Design a protein around this nucleic acid. Structure first.
Ligand SMILES: [Mg+2]
Ligand SMILES: [Mg+2]
Ligand SMILES: [Mg+2]
Ligand SMILES: [Mg+2]
Ligand SMILES: [Mg+2]
Ligand SMILES: [Mg+2]
Ligand SMILES: [Mg+2]
Ligand SMILES: [Mg+2]
Ligand SMILES: [Mg+2]
Ligand SMILES: [Mg+2]
Ligand SMILES: [Zn+2]
Lengths: 23, 96, 128, 116, 122, 72, 99, 49, 86, 136
RNA sequence: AAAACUCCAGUUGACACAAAAUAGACUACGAAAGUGGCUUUAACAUAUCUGAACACACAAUAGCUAAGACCCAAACUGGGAUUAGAUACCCCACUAUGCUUAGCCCUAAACCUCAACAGUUAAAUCAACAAAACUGCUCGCCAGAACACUACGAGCCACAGCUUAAAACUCAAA
């Protein structure tokens, strides 16, 4: 319903966490 | 002419029913009064619609019950065996 | 600071001072009273010594004295009890309200303002 | 007696916290819910247990202890036939029982008017 | 403020009971309080097994000690009662005669809380 | 009106009368109507105590003829 | 809601309809229905009520009028072009004894 | 009126000399503040049984 | 368990009526709230879920009481057919 | 007539069972859980007489939470208790499960009479934290 | 169904430094978060209102330092069933953690998503849901989406973060 933006923000946050965890 | 309706105090009003212990004082020393509202089986405390009180009365009753149970004047897991012949006030349903 | 045996307000303007013995005088004093009685006694003494008429309760002077005694009580509580956030916020709000009342009084009447600042000892500072 | 809901639902004139937060609005409909039915019974267990016990005690032939197995079979047959005959031929009863049809008919006779 | 104390013993009847009562009276007197009266509820059974302090206790006597305690002596009295071995337990509760009764009318038929939804039909 | 309070006090003291209300008759004078008429015709005189007027009306209706079989 | 200036007062949660303005509006209604039937009018008693459905239908038959205390379908007086026929004279006056 | 009531009530306290008699009177007495109520609100004392 | 023994939750059996006493004890436990309490405490219960289910049970009880009152009020006209046709 | 409450250990206990009162009756504690139950017969002066469970007859997994095994264990315990010399007992229920009345029926059919049916459910008042809610 | 242990369980007598069923069909206190076994004390501000990201203070839970404690639950881990594969849903044991002291970034769907000061609804009438709609003032924000709970800059008893906060490109949308 209205959770697509929240899931996109969650995916972006997870990608940023993976990036800051890699290096 | 002078038979007009007059808005007065509105009669036909009987005195509102009060609590069974509103006119008396509730203390923790009275073990029988605070134990009569306890189920003589599981030792559970009856609610408001079972005893027939309001807010302040039920609050004072449960406060006195907890005080007597902590200080050591009334059991919590059951009812006092010496006070089992008290008049039944609350409504039951078990044992038909 | 009133002594522990100084006779409060509720049993002050009553006939028969020396008619009682010692136990009655001790039970009706601050020995078997409360902190609210001491606060009321301090407020009455301040309103009788500092300002003129100690009868007006809706005046600004009574409000200032009440805020001052509440600030003193909160400071004593924070000195006795270390960790206390709600009382600290209450003390801060009381200090802010007292400063605002002193500002308003100085804006409307400088005589009673300087009288209060000389009696209670506090001084209204200018906020930067 | 029903408890009042003065400060229950979160409305514009409630300067406190809502305690009851229902999913559906507190507006009754015009139909009654269906009665509970179709449950698992699995009655007669002690009789089967004692029958198996008396079978294991003696030999496999039912001549040494025929009374126990005969009574077990009689009780099981009586219970099964009674339940079947009841659920097949009788569903009303006496005064006050399973009454959904007339209940919903009376509810539709005097429905609710929420639209003023 | 007036307070009351419930003393619980462990079978001594007269001598040790009177000794402990005199000791408690002297303590309340020299600590900074005034003793009003001293009553006794009797010698009945305990509602539960008290194996708190020493070994078994299932039969004690209840007492009532009414006095006027200040504000810096109830803790000392509780500590003295906890250090003493004769007394099992006892709380210094306030006297109920300070708080009087109000003008409560009992129960009241609450109405139906309406004005909660709009006039929609859905 | 005041007659409502009079009838309320009458029902609180005594209760329902032995006569049955006949709503078919437009001018049906029941026990309460006769009682309130006696009360107002005695009040039209000039007294201030309501208990005296009440007991006087009661004694008058008792000595007249109708006997209100009240409760114990 | 639309029933406040037509009530004189209440009597123990029982509203009393005032007969002052009632008789005023009644004569204006009887006079309106009198001139309609005088100029060859058609009345219709539409009162769906299961208590006096026999007395209403007989008073219209003895006087040569029309009654309707039965169930109301759909396209009666509204869709009269495809139900009762081509051109049908609709009743110019309907009496609602039970709304 | 309140201070007169307090002065009249203070005449029955416990002093330094009244200790043995007080403890004897306390041990020779049994006070029970137990009383139940019924559906109306009566007072029933277990001491009368 | 520092109280007594055969006093708390104890019934009697007369003429060998064991099933009757068992049903009585079960009804007492269901009315005093014990079986459902044990079923809830069988696993860990979240406080949010606890308050949500409490509000749900309260709303359901209120709705059931309202429906019961409506049924008891409307059972005055579900007799028979007073007027035929009409 | 006939008080449903248990008699006080007091004086004058006016019920007789095989020439004995109510306090001098051996107790039968039963801990019925969700998949296994145990039945023990203890005398009045606290002496163990018999003890078994669902696994003492040959049942492996799953079948222990069945009323048949509970009734068998109850009958076995009743027989072991009768081998010594007891008549009247007092059943004690501890916990709920599928075998809550099966043990009682087994003790009844074994040759033992019950007069009091008590239950001491070990349920705390917001005490210890149970296991987390599993995801079914 | 495994697997986990046999110094395993059962009635009796002797035991705790977080966690207070029923009362709770109660609506309370507190600015919010939050809080309901008992005993005692201090105490829940402001006589018009509003008003900081130019400031101060409080503030769900989790994570750190050193000491005191550990029944049970449990990040991780080890072992054990199913599946072609299971680092998850099925079972047991265990570490940090739930507790108190003094010092830390102040984090949420911090949701009743509805700011406070007052009143009104037969003069006022609303896209649709949701919890019906307005009049007078004020604080911060908006005016197309991802890019972006993002580098830098400005501060933080901290260097895997928090507060404020974009450009370039694509799209005729969202
Ligand atoms: Mg919903
Ligand atoms: Mg603690
Ligand atoms: Mg402000
Ligand atoms: Mg640990
Ligand atoms: Mg574990
Ligand atoms: Mg924090
Ligand atoms: Mg919240
Ligand atoms: Mg919000
Ligand atoms: Mg604002
Ligand atoms: Mg912030
Ligand atoms: Zn009452």
């Amino acid at each position: 319903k209205n959770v697509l933006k929240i899931r996109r923000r969650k995916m972006n946050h997870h990608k940023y966490r993976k990036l800051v965890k890699k290096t | 002419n002078e038979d007009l309706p007059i808005s007065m105090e509105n009669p036909y009003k009987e005195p509102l029913k009060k609590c069974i212990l509103c006119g008396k004082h509730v203390d923790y020393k009275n073990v029988q009064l605070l134990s009569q509202f306890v189920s003589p089986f599981t030792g559970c405390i009856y609610g408001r619609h079972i005893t027939g009180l309001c807010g302040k009365k039920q609050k004072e009753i449960t406060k006195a019950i907890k005080r007597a149970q902590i200080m050591g004047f009334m059991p919590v897991t059951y009812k006092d065996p010496a006070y089992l012949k008290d008049p039944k006030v609350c409504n039951i349903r078990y044992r038909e | 600071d009133p002594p522990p045996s100084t006779l409060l307000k509720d049993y002050q303007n009553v006939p028969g001072i020396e008619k009682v013995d010692d136990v009655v005088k001790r039970l009706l004093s601050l020995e078997m009273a409360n902190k609210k009685e001491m606060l009321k006694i301090k407020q009455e003494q301040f309103m009788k010594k500092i300002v003129a008429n100690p009868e007006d309760t809706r005046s600004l002077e009574a409000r200032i004295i009440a805020l001052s005694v509440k600030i003193r009580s909160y400071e004593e509580h924070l000195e006795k009890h270390r960790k206390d956030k709600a009382h600290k916020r209450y003390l801060l709000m009381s200090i802010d309200q007292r400063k605002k009342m002193l500002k308003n009084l100085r804006n409307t009447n400088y005589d009673v303002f300087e009288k209060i600042c000389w009696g209670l000892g506090i001084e209204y500072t200018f906020p930067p | 007696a029903t408890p009042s809901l003065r400060g229950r639902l979160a409305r514009f004139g409630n300067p406190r916290k809502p305690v009851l937060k229902p999913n559906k609005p507190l507006i009754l409909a015009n139909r009654v819910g269906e009665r509970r039915r179709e449950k698992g019974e699995a009655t007669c267990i002690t009789e089967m247990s004692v029958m198996m016990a008396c079978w294991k005690q003696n030999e496999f032939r039912d001549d040494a202890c025929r009374k126990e197995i005969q009574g077990f079979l009689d009780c099981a047959a009586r219970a099964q036939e009674a339940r079947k005959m009841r659920s097949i031929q009788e569903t009303l009863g006496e005064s006050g029982s399973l009454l959904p049809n007339k209940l919903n008919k009376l509810l539709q006779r005097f429905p609710n008017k929420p639209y003023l | 403020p007036r307070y009351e104390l419930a003393l619980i013993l462990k079978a001594m009847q007269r001598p040790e009971t009177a000794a402990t009562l005199k000791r408690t009276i002297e303590a309340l007197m020299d600590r900074g309080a005034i003793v009003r009266d001293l009553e006794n509820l009797g010698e009945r059974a305990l509602p539960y097994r008290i194996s708190a302090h020493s070994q078994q206790h299932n039969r004690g006597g209840y007492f009532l000690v009414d006095f006027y305690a200040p504000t810096a002596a109830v803790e000392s009295m509780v500590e003295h009662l906890s250090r003493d071995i004769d007394v099992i337990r006892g709380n210094i509760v306030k006297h109920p005669l300070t708080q009087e009764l109000k003008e409560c009318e009992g129960i009241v038929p609450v109405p139906l809380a309406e004005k909660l939804y709009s006039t929609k039909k859905r | 009106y005041h007659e409502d309070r009079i009838r309320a006090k009458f029902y609180s003291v005594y209760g329902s009368g032995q006569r049955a209300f006949d709503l078919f008759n437009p001018n049906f004078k029941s026990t309460c109507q006769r009682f309130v008429e006696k009360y107002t015709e005695l009040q039209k005189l000039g007294e201030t105590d309501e208990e005296k007027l009440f007991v006087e009306t009661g004694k008058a209706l008792l000595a007249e003829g109708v006997i209100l079989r009240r409760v114990g | 809601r639309f029933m406040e200036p037509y009530i004189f007062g209440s009597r123990l949660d029982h509203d009393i309809i005032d007969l002052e303005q009632t008789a005023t509006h009644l004569q204006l209604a009887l006079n309106f229905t009198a001139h309609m039937a005088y100029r060859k009018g058609i009345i219709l008693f539409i009162s769906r009520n299961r208590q006096f459905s026999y007395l209403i239908e007989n008073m219209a038959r003895d006087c040569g009028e029309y009654a309707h205390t039965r169930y109301f379908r759909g396209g009666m007086l509204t869709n009269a072009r495809l139900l009762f026929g081509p051109t049908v004279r609709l009743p110019d006056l309907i009496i609602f004894l039970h709304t | 009126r309140e201070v007169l009531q307090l002065q009249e009530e203070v005449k029955n306290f416990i002093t330094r000399e009244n200790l043995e008699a007080r403890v004897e009177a306390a041990l020779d007495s049994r006070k029970n503040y137990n009383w139940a109520i019924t559906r109306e609100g009566l007072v029933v004392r277990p001491q009368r049984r | 368990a520092k109280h007594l023994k055969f006093i708390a939750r104890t019934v009697m059996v007369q003429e060998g009526n064991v099933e009757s006493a068992y049903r009585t004890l079960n009804r007492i436990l269901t009315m005093d709230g014990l079986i459902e309490d044990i079923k809830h405490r069988r696993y860990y219960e979240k406080p949010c879920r606890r308050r949500q289910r409490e509000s749900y049970e309260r709303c359901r009880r209120i709705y059931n009481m309202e429906m019961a009152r409506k049924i008891n009020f409307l059972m005055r006209k579900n007799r028979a057919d007073p007027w035929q046709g009409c | 007539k006939f008080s449903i409450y248990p008699p006080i250990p007091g004086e004058e206990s006016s019920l007789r069972w095989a020439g004995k009162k109510f306090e001098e009756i051996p107790i039968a504690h039963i801990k019925a859980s969700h998949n296994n139950t145990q039945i023990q017969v203890v005398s009045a002066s606290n002496e163990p007489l018999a003890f078994a469970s669902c696994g003492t007859e040959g049942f492996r997994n799953a079948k222990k939470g069945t009323g048949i095994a509970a009734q068998t264990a109850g009958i076995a315990a009743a027989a072991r208790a009768k081998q010594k010399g007891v008549i009247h007992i007092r059943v004690v229920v501890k916990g709920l499960g599928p075998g809550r009345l099966s043990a009682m029926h087994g003790l009844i059919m074994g040759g033992l009479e019950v007069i009091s049916i008590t239950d001491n459910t070990p349920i705390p008042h917001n005490g210890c934290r149970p296991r987390k809610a599993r995801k079914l």
